[PDB]
């Protein structure tokens, strides 16, 4: 399915990348496709938190 | 109790330095090239 | 006659107060202190090479660049065929954060960050193209991009 | 002999005051002070093309 | 007890010295050839 | 070394000490020396570089222990820049690099 | 099999380069091909520890 | 015991004698011949 | 003694000593001179090189 | 066999030569061939010790 | 016992005039013929 990675994170936003090559940016409250709702924005650790469980981070060798 | 007034005096400092560097907003640049 | 002596060792005493041991232990505890002030907090960024594609689109969202302080990240600017693509002007926003170097004529610009923590925008102008360029430049993260290669759609 | 063993500490703790480790949590502090000066209140805004 | 304000005293020229070192970032310098 | 340009690959390392020389030459993929065209150091309170201004090397001075960075290369024929990293105090000096470019 | 040395190594980082020549770069928490999970950098003394219980060094004449 | 005192005159002046020697670093000089 | 420019071998060793001088003349392999084009030297304060 | 000689030696590291002309550097925990494994490198009076017992010195005219 | 002293003082002088005797290195001269 589609994977998404982030590429940058301040303190409220997220800009993340997914592997088609598409760029999206996103704040506490806001729609993800294939996810579901973002519940929390960790701007430390590089950690995303999804309303199904899902935790959204940085591509392993790209990070 | 005298305690609050001398945090007063190292506070008032460095709120006086936070609000005046939150203060500046400069000037941006414009390279022409030929 | 041990006056001689005695004074003899106090004045070698007073002359080089310091034992050459003391001299290692005391060179060592210095350089293990630079190397403490030297040291980085957490881990350093992993410097990476990238290449993104450039939608001049009025739905996408223009492309992040990640820096560092003190750092230099290389901006080069080509076509979609894969040409060099030669750059016009630009206009920064914020320079008391980031310092461009550029020669007048080519299609490659040089960005270091000043700052920690602020970011910013930048714009440039190619020659052929009417719209303008805009980039946003993000410092501090967990990657530094080295060079960015971006592929524009015209 | 044992006076200038005590005077060669003293003297590294008058030289340093500072040990590595509270060198680099110091560091860390300031750091994290810039951090907590450069960040923006509420949520900042979308970037955003428009025709 | 008074030891802690001659240690405050070395202590701060010390912590003084450490973050104004932290201050300085220099600007690059790029060479030309020809 | 080898010097590839892809996306992915990493960018080379050079191990420096201070006070003591370290030379960089460019080659190609065969070998031929490249002249350089330009060169931008970032902070040059922690290295001193000589270099006359048409020839195919460096000469790098370290100026601080453990203070490391960064470096860009721009060759006479390239457009794509050369990225450099530089990390002084290891266990090892590189005295002299070959570094061969793909081109 | 393959084997890697140290190239360098900062608190944090470490570079590492293999018997084929390519070249890698790790933090802490990292995956190496071949060795497993990375367990502790330890700049001083130029050793890597790996969850296999390898520990990973310099090249002995290149060092 | 006002040893420990003098001993710290001699040991300063030297320990500040060696800090100062250590601190400078030199630029290289590039030599070229025609 | 002989240098090797490989990329494994080692490079030369000069002993030295304070106040006096020591020569180093370049032949190639055959034993004929080999003019210097450019010299770099570091730490200046430590050695003196004299040279036409 | 061969036979080898100090060549420089400074407190941590020793430079020695052959009698074949090859050139070599070792520290406190390194590995000669046909010697052993080096025990004690001692900067004055010019002396090395390794694991079979020999002591590494100047070649005697040339010192 | 106050010979230490006065001895001191002899030596102090001796020993500071030996070890400025040790510190100087002159620059050698080259000397060209035609």
């Known amino acids: 399915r589609i994977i998404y990675y982030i590429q940058a994170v301040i303190p409220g936003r997220a800009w993340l990348i997914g592997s088609n090559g598409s760029t999206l940016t996103v704040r506490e409250g806001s729609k993800i496709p294939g996810y579901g709702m973002v519940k929390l924005i960790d701007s430390l650790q590089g950690r995303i938190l999804t309303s199904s469980g899902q935790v959204i981070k940085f591509s392993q060798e790209d990070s | 109790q005298q305690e609050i007034q001398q945090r007063t005096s190292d506070m008032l400092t460095a709120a006086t330095q936070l609000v005046q560097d939150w203060k500046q907003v400069e000037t941006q640049v414009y390279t022409e090239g030929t | ?154």
Not at chain 3, 36 to 60: C, E, R, Y
């Open chain 3, 1 to 154: 006659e041990v006056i001689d002596k005695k004074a003899f060792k106090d004045m070698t005493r007073n002359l080089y107060p310091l034992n050459p041991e003391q001299v290692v232990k005391l060179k060592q505890i210095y350089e293990t202190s630079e190397y403490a002030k030297a040291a980085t907090p957490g881990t350093p960024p992993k410097p990476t090479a990238t290449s993104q594609f450039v939608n001049l689109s009025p739905g996408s969202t223009p492309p992040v660049i990640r820096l560092s302080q003190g750092f230099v990240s290389s901006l080069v600017f080509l076509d979609s065929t894969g040409a060099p693509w030669p750059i016009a002007a630009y206009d920064l926003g914020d320079p008391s954060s980031f310092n461009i170097q550029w020669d007048k004529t080519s299609n490659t610009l040089m960005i270091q960050a000043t700052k920690l923590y602020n970011y910013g925008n930048l714009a440039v102008r190619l020659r052929g193209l009417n719209t303008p360029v805009m980039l946003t430049l993000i410092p501090g993260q967990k990657a530094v991009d080295y060079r960015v290669d971006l592929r524009v759609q015209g």
